[PDB]
Design a protein around this ligand. Structure first.
Ligand SMILES: Nc1ncnc2c1ncn2[C@@H]1O[C@H](COP(=O)(O)OP(=O)(O)NP(=O)(O)O)[C@@H](O)[C@H]1O
Lengths: 343, 10
């Protein structure tokens, strides 16, 4: 057989013979291994979608597969190969995705003391990845440090495309990174992603989660205590039921960004470049805005003095990815299989 | 131009 089985913890990894020396790197709710591609003479990451058990997983796996092939960008994780051990549609069970192997999570970077140049450059690349997805009207929706991978040369790529979709109107976004429009059930546009960037940027500066809500409702308490109760113009935009609860909350003044992010928490202003704590804080104050209509866009974030120094139109103005929604599990299984065989 | 930066990753 062209394949072979190797146990990783408890689950079985039935991969192509070309992929050798499989080692576990990360966990999910898909298990990821680091391997060596004997044919390509390079290190790879192999994700086993543990995929069509229910209609939710099916849409998540289909989205991941379709978007991974269409998107071709420096700051998006690239698809190298897709395969299945099974030989028929009836046999079909497991889906394996082969990608470029990165050295770490952004969790490790949050436990590091960076200089302005590395923070800025990491954020710039993140924004390039997000701008690319948005140029095709795709919103990531689940940006968090475990979805952001980095290399020792300070390069970065975005990872999860399971929830990635167009602008719309349940609990699938990770709590701490949920924007007010996701927490409060409003409609979300592209800049929902900028709130996630602000939470990640704040985590990098403070080295702790920015809004550590204890549940999905306490998440709102954490945001209004730090930022202040939103103004009545934002309240009018809420559904009457959510609005009554939000207006019933105790009133918060919030804290200034100078008190939330003092100079001492940012890297020292280098004598060798023009990057400054006051610009990083200004950028944070434009991303961590509750009302999405008053919060900046990805483009405005790329134009920001803390980020624009790296601007390169080859990465920042790259052509949009060319993309060519309710089915049963049987219709989905058939749909996944057709895409696996095609690529 | 493309920078020459490093992250000490364990
Ligand atoms: N291509 C890759 N290169 C390096 N590390 C990777 C790669 N893909 C995944 N990882 C690692 O594996 C972890 C889990 O991957 P993955 O399941 O795709 O993301 P996730 O959305 O955070 N998981 P989950 O939401 O719990 O299902 C990541 O946080 C990384 O540590």
């Amino acid at each position: 057989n062209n394949f072979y089985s190797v146990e990783i913890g408890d689950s079985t990894f039935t991969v192509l013979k070309r992929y050798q020396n499989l080692k576990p790197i990360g966990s999910g709710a898909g298990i990821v291994c680091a391997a060596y591609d004997a044919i390509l003479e390079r290190n790879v990451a192999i994700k086993k979608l543990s995929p069509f058990q229910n209609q939710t997983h099916a849409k998540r796996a289909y989205r991941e597969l379709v978007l991974m092939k269409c998107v071709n960008h420096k700051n998006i994780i690239g698809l190298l190969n897709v395969f299945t051990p099974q030989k028929s549609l009836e046999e079909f069970q497991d889906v394996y995705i082969v990608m470029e192997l990165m050295d770490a999570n952004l969790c490790q970077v949050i436990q590091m003391e960076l200089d302005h140049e590395r923070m800025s450059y990491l954020l710039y690349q993140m924004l390039c990845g997000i701008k690319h997805l948005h140029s095709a009207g795709i919103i990531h929706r689940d940006l968090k440090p475990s979805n952001i991978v980095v290399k020792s040369d300070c390069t970065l790529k975005i990872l999860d495309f399971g929830l990635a979709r167009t602008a719309g109107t349940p609990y699938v976004v990770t709590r701490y990174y949920r924007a007010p429009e996701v927490i409060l059930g409003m409609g979300y546009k592209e800049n929902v992603d900028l709130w996630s960037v602000g939470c990640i940027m704040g985590e990098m500066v403070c080295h702790k989660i920015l809004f550590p809500g204890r549940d999905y409702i306490d998440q709102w308490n954490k945001v209004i205590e730090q930022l202040g109760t939103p103004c009545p113009e934002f309240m009018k935009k809420l559904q009457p039921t959510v609005r009554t609860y939000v207006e019933n909350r105790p009133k918060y003044a919030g804290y200034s960004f100078e008190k939330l992010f003092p100079d001492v928490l940012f890297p020292a202003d280098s004598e060798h470049n023009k990057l400054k704590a006051s610009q990083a804080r200004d950028l944070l104050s434009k991303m961590l805005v509750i009302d999405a209509s008053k919060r900046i866009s990805v483009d405005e974030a790329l134009q920001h003095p803390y980020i624009n120094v790296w601007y390169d139109p080859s990465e920042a103005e790259a052509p949009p990815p060319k993309i060519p929604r309710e089915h049963t599990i049987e219709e989905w299984k058939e749909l996944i299989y057709k895409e696996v065989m095609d690529l | 131009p493309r920078p020459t930066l490093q992250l000490p990753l364990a």
